[PDB]
C-alpha cells in the first residue's frame, strides 16, 4: 500500500505521510523535515 507524500492531503491524527514526515492541520497537507 502506497503512502502519502509531501504535497499530498492528510488529516491530523492519521499521519498517512511516510516515516519522517509531519502532518499540518492548518492547511491539511504533508510536511518534510528540512
Amino acid at each position: 500500500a502506497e503512502c502519502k507524500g509531501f504535497w499530498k492531503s492528510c488529516v491530523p491524527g492519521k499521519n498517512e505521510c511516510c516515516s519522517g514526515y509531519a502532518c499540518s492541520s492548518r492547511d491539511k497537507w504533508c510536511k518534510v523535515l528540512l
Side-chain angles (χ1 to χ4, degrees):
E2 283 77 28
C3 69
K4 256 59 169 176
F6 171 54
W7 51 89
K8 283 297 191 84
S9 77
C10 72
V11 284
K14 283 207 189 274
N15 289 349
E16 306 281 346
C17 304
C18 305
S19 188
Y21 292 70
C23 257
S24 226
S25 191
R26 191 185 190 287
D27 251 39
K28 278 178 64 165
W29 53 18
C30 275
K31 310 294 257 153
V32 62
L33 305 156
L34 82 175

